[PDB]
Amino acid sequence: VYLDRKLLTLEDKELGSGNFGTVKKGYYQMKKVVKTVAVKILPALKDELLAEANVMQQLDNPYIVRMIGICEAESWMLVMEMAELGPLNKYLQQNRHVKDKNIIELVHQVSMGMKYLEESNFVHRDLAARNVLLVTQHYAKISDFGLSKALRADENYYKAQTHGKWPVKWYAPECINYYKFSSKSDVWSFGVLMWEAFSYGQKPYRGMKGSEVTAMLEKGERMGCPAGCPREMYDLMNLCWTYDVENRPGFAAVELRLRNYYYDVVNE
Numbered sequence: 001v002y003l004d005r006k007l008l009t010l011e012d013k014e015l016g017s018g019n020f021g022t023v024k025k026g027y028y029q030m031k032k033v034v035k036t037v038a039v040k041i042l043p044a045l046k047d048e049l050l051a052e053a054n055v056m057q058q059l060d061n062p063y064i065v066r067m068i069g070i071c072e073a074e075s076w077m078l079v080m081e082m083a084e085l086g087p088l089n090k091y092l093q094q095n096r097h098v099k100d101k102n103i104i105e106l107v108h109q110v111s112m113g114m115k116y117l118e119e120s121n122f123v124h125r126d127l128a129a130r131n132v133l134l135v136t137q138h139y140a141k142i143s144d145f146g147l148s149k150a151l152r153a154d155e156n157y158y159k160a161q162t163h164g165k166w167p168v169k170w171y172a173p174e175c176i177n178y179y180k181f182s183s184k185s186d187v188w189s190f191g192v193l194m195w196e197a198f199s200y201g202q203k204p205y206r207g208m209k210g211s212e213v214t215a216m217l218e219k220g221e222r223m224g225c226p227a228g229c230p231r232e233m234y235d236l237m238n239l240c241w242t243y244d245v246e247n248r249p250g251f252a253a254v255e256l257r258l259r260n261y262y263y264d265v266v267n268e
Contacts, residue, residue: 001057003028003069003079010039015086019165020045020146021075028068028079037068040078048146049076055122055148056080063113065133065143083133083141089201091134096200098137100228101265103197106132106140108258113142114190115251118183121151123158125181127189128170129196149181157182168210169203174245176214184248191240198229217243232261 013025015038026039042049049070056067056078071077085091088106092098110132117124125147133143149158160179172188174180192204204223205213222241225234236257242248249257 001053001069003071003077005071005073008037008039008071008077008079018146020048025082026079035068036082036084038065038080038082040080042076046076049078052145052148053078055145055150058150059117059120059122061113061116063109063116063141065141080143081141083135083143085134085136087130088132088134088140089129089196091137092129092197092201095137098200100230101262101268102137104230104233104258104262104265105138106134107194107197108255108262109140110142110193111190111251111255111258114183114186115255117142117186118251121183123149123151123181123183124186124189125149125158126167126170127186127193128167129193129201132193157185169205169208169213172245172248173217173243182245183251184245187240187248187251187254190251190254191237192223194233194237194240195223195226198226198233200226202226230261230265236261 007029009027011025011027015023015025017023020040021042024039024041026037028035028037040049053067053070060066065083066081068079068081071079114124114127124142124145126144127142131142131144133141135141151158158181160181163179168176170189170192172185174182175185195204196202205216208216222238225231236254239249240254
């Protein structure tokens with residue numbers, strides 16, 4: 001779990017920043033190879049990182065950004081796999097000629113990763129296009145496990161109490177109203193992610209306040225079909241946005257719907 005500071009080199013390339021601190025590009029020397037890595041650099045911040053680290057350690061799947069380990073130096077450091085092409089929302093913004101089949105491919109990969117997380121009884125709680133990272137144009141991984149929670153053995157939801165930065169436009173009604181987060185809450189977020197992807201990285205609920213989204217959703221209103229989005233994918237989107245948790249699909253069924261449609265488009 002713990003890494004060697006002598007084997008780690010930090011570059012000048014800042015990849016991103018948040019409240020926690022920054023993420024920087026780095027290099028970690030292995031047995032024979034040197035591995036390009038992304039490094040999260042930071043009492044409250046340290047305990048969150050150690051929690052994030054323990055969450056990430058349990059997780060092993062091709063469609064998630066894996067943790068290499070942790071390092072304590074000038075600051076606490078979380079060393080993770082590098083996804084060079086960056087966040088999906090920004091990529092699609094800068095690459096408008098990306099094909100419909102390609103978007104389906106990428107969102108299907110996210111659903112496989114989320115299917116695994118669901119199976120593992122972890123809730124992501126920050127599932128958005130900005131947090132899905134591209135290794136290649138045809139290979140996406142889920143990242144940013146800062147708000148993620150391992151579910152208790154006897155519970156299918158996590159109940160929050162005190163809170164700060166919450167991405168409301170991605171949050172299900174049960175999250176906003178009851179502070180309750182399940183894998184079905186991530187499915188709602190997945191629907192918004194799908195909308196983002198087929199909108200080529202446009203922000204959801206443009207120009208709207210959190211409260212204005214809530215009123216919209218209580219009217220039974222949902223975001224419309226993005227231009228060029230296939231009807232089968234918009235229908236899956238809306239099903240993800242089922243108000244009632246009990247009737248909202250799980251990720252297994254979502255992944256299956258995406259898997260089936262992708263192969264149908266592959267045969268064209």
